[PDB]
Design a protein around this ligand. Structure first.
Ligand code: 5AK
Ligand code: 5AK
Ligand code: 5AK
Ligand code: 5AK
Lengths: 253, 260, 263, 260
């Protein structure tokens, strides 16, 4: 079982990694990626292997608080190393979000969400759903979230928490003015498979596109397209940790 | 084939109804016992009544909605197109689109009651405070206190669910959404706040705390349930069937309702 | 000083009530439930609301005092163990009065005559069956046409109650105003509403006018009664204020802190 | 008396500006762009915001007038076509005052006067402690906090879910910005309205580098120890000629404007 282990950068994350590397290691051709740190560290491990997501099972270990991705306690590593080498383990697939920027295309993959902000002034775009105009937005920005990313930025924006077994994407508003000229729906929008949300600029055409907090200052933007990606992220399932339990322990104590 | 038409009650619906019935005088016969096509004329509430009127044979009935007033999400056919609809289904040249439904189970302390919802199923209190425990898949999630709770169908998300601050879902997604009704997050009764979208095979159980009397409403059919032990929510295996002739996208229909 | 005490009805409240009465007996304190100058509410916020409505004609000659036998309330903020020190401060008259604004609700019919109600928390208006459809007229000028469950006008002190659960803003009771909050507005193109909570100052009148149905379920501090053939429902900050006998200094924001955050 | 006119930038705001300056020359009206008694803004609310900060040291002897070249503004409520009447009414000689927000930053004590709001973001994660009148209230974590003026409730505050407050009420409102409310960081959620003499002290937790924006004048402050909020004694004055109610401007902005 060719595997590969990432680390945050602290002493503990670099130490426990050595405690697991003792019990083949391939960083170019991995089948088992073990993230050590938190959810942010897990995101970096995801972006490191986007091209080969269809051949990789991910495992998250938190050296800090309980994360929706990094859930395994550091003490579980001694039992985690033996079960992964056993060869017998079932995978769990979560949907992903595809983000295309038009000018020559520019595709992106997101595990949490992909937000579109402004590069200084107001954010004014036209929301086009399946080649049909829906609304003209004005405010801070917009947020298209993955089912697993709903518990992140999406929830803080007033989004709905949906179970990752649902193949869809959720669009939420970011401080919409919502007046006569720029009447927005207000409510979060959940789009299924093969549904495309096309963001079209009115002016400016310079937006701050952020994919999992990786915010790039895109210039000369003519179109931004969102859709449920065909590629799915696989998790190595050993124990039983229900999604709603993880949500309960996070926000409801 | 066999068909029937329900009416809202106003002159506009009953007159338009008789005008369409005479149009089937094709190989169409009127029958309100075992129909193959059911036409609703009036509003969404009129359509909901036609749903429960024939919720015993949903798998053999195609519904068609006609709105005499403003645009509805079920009744989306304008009375000006009533002429074309008669000939269209007369030849049987149309497709079939299915939307998910919601199953509501009420257990007492006895038997049990099962209900089907096209819009949503809401549970409020019989006057005083509404205090229950939210159980998801035999696992506790929160203790709710406030007015009530709302479990919505994907197609019903644009109804009461939206006004309660819920999220809109496309009716091709087989799921259900739970939204709060004036919850009081005062450290004693911590709730999630955010709407919760549950997939298939997931069971959301509402278990009472002190009071055991609840006002359970299924698509605005509220009847008092005394001595309730459990209220279970899950996506029904039964599906409503529409007879879409043209192409009226769900999101486009949302745009014409709220955005315009 | 004429006084009286209301009780929640449980063992603890009734017991504490009797001992407090005997405590006042040691001083110049006369018991009177007809014309009291001091009204003590032993129980909760719900018990406090009953005591308020019990004497809503003598609000000026009365300084209310709340005692909570259970969890902390925004009105009943005195612990039962402090009932002994409460008497000794009341008997001497060693206290100052703090006033909170109130909400006036005026109901007009097809004139049988008229009806006015005072609210300490809020006043809600809903339908008696179908949809709730009214025109919101702010100062003789039409603002919006509403459709949904209803509308809730809250007092500053009542913002921590039903108002907060409906997404309303929390106001400090020193501010003389009122807050209108929506109750499940459909908010479409036909019935476009503001969505946001509205805070109206004094001398501002919010008029609710029927569109079709004239039967409305009006609830003042959860005293819900059915009003038929309603012509108009007016909202405005009353000139009457509830008075509290202040001894210590319990911050309103701390009461919010202890109730919704941690304590 | 002395007057001046500020312009947006486009030809529309400049052409209308010159037209007014000419008309006032026919009346006894001195022209000073340094020490005026009357300041006229042409363009929009953003143009008015600039006209406020440009002369925020002489708010005592200045009555502002707003003219919207585009859509209706809450500070620019006069129409371009009504400019001819405006020149006449200002030449012949009521005044309305709105509350202002005082933003104090301690690292040197910097003072800021906001007409709309004063937001505080981070630089990544924004984490501060909220202190109200020398006592702890909550520990915030999210995008940031927004303290708004009564007249500024219709701006960023409304978009953040804040309540609309009439300018007659001398107060300030605090709203959350994408707050993550969980076990560790439990916030109130609801917007908070503060009366006069009430001080909201924002004190850092982790990093001392916060982005402070007073009326879109985003300035990165370094080594901040405390950010105070209070209802400023300074009040912006307006010139009244025609009754244009605050709730009307709210209606004509967010609801509908049938006569336009
Ligand atoms: N989302 C907002 N909605 C309705 N008012 C806002 C918003 N945002 C700010 S300023 C905060 C900000 O920089 N947001 C980034 C995008 C943006 C910028 C300026 C205007 C707009 Br719109 C959007 N405002 C108001 O803009 C005024 C300055 O022109 C300030 O008073 C903000 O209140
Ligand atoms: N307020 C948020 N609540 C709950 N998730 C968030 C939030 N904000 C972001 S990122 C957007 C951002 O720059 N917000 C400004 C302040 C901030 C920054 C980072 C994290 C946090 Br927390 C706050 N996230 C999620 O953090 C994920 C990991 O980087 C990002 O993908 C967002 O999903
Ligand atoms: N959802 C609410 N959240 C936080 N305060 C409320 C709420 N609802 C009301 S009364 C409205 C109502 O009929 N609600 C039905 C369920 C219910 C009833 C009473 C209390 C409660 Br909690 C729930 N209140 C406050 O209860 C006080 C009466 O003792 C009133 O002043 C309401 O403000
Ligand atoms: N506020 C709502 N917003 C948008 N849809 C609603 C709402 N309320 C219900 S029903 C819940 C209810 O009893 N509300 C009391 C007032 C009311 C009644 C019927 C319709 C309306 Br509108 C208001 N609905 C939808 O109306 C259908 C009734 O035919 C229900 O299925 C709800 O989906």
């Amino acid at each position: 079982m060719k595997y590969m282990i990432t680390s945050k950068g602290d002493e503990k994350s670099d130490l426990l990694r050595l405690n697991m590397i003792a019990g083949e290691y391939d960083d170019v051709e991995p089948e088992i990626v073990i993230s050590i740190g938190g959810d942010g560290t897990f995101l970096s491990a995801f972006h490191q292997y986007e091209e080969r997501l269809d051949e990789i099972a991910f495992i998250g270990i938190h050296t800090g608080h309980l994360g929706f991705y990094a859930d395994w306690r550091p003490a579980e590593a001694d039992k985690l190393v033996k079960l992964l080498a056993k060869g017998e383990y079932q995978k769990v697939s979560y949907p992903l979000l595809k983000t295309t920027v038009k000018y020559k295309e520019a595709t992106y993959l997101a595990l949490n969400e992909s937000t579109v902000k402004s590069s200084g002034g107001p954010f004014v775009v036209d929301v086009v759903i399946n080649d049909i105009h829906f609304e003209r937005f004005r405010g801070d920005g917009l947020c298209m979230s993955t089912p697993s990313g709903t518990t992140a930025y999406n929830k803080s924006l007033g989004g709905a928490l949906m179970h990752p077994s649902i193949e869809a994407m959720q669009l939420t508003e970011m401080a919409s003015i919502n007046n006569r000229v720029y009447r927005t729906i207000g409510s979060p929008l959940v789009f299924p498979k093969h549904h495309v949300v096309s963001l079209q600029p009115v002016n400016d055409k310079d937006f701050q596109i952020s994919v999992d907090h990786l915010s790039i200052l895109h210039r000369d933007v003519q179109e931004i397209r969102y859709e449920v990606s065909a590629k799915k992220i696989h998790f190595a399932r050993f124990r039983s940790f229900p999604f709603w339990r993880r949500v309960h322990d996070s926000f409801i104590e």
